């Protein structure tokens, strides 16, 4: 079946709704389904958050390696490595970054938040880089809560998409800056069930995933196809299946994207 045709399928059969962009390096279309509709970013952000650090080193208005000092109060739902660095009393800026894209870490993203002036600075960064569409109104994990219909914490596919391609390809960040994002979403622990669980094994793949309260379930970033690069946003909405359920899911889009791909 066509790649529209497939995710409908899957649409249907799982009472689900999937959008999906995929763009070249320059952010040119090249598929989507539902692309435009705004789903809840859960923490996807964390990547674009990272990428606003890394701008801040490259600028010299932040340090990689500055330490930010917190107590119990930062730990909140799902910070692992936040709680082992606790008794330390820091984390560095680049500790706390990398935990909050390869762990999703949770306390670690909202130290990140406290020392940039928090979601509106965000917001601002994703406005800097040419996306007018993704906003981060709120701290994790209740900016994770997607209330239905709420435009809270918000992106589409195709803006999503666009922002990746902008970080990896279309010169955000230094040479040096870029490697290490691209790096670190490579090694993500997260995402081993969800889209790269779809693509072939030898494409070079990194990703952020997100889960959202009412059925969401999202996964950003990269693949390499052979010499080929492409930027990728998926986020789906499915509130009757189960956790596992809506991780397969989305590895079954990285599969119907694979098969697009490979017509080629």
Known sequence: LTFKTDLEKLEREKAAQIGVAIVDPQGEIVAGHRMAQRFAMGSTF????AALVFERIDSGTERGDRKLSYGPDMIVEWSPATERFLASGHMTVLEAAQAAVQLS???ATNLLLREIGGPAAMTQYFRKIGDSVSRLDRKEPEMSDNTPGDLRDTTTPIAMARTVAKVLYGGALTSTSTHTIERWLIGNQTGDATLRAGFP???????KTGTCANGGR????????????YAVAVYTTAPKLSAVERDELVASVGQVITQLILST
């Open 46 to 49: 964390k990547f674009p958050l």
């Open 105 to 107: 870490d949770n306390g």
């Open 201 to 207: 094994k030898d494409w070079v793949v990194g990703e």
């Open 218 to 229: 999202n996964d950003i970033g990269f693949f390499k196809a052979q010499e080929r690069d």
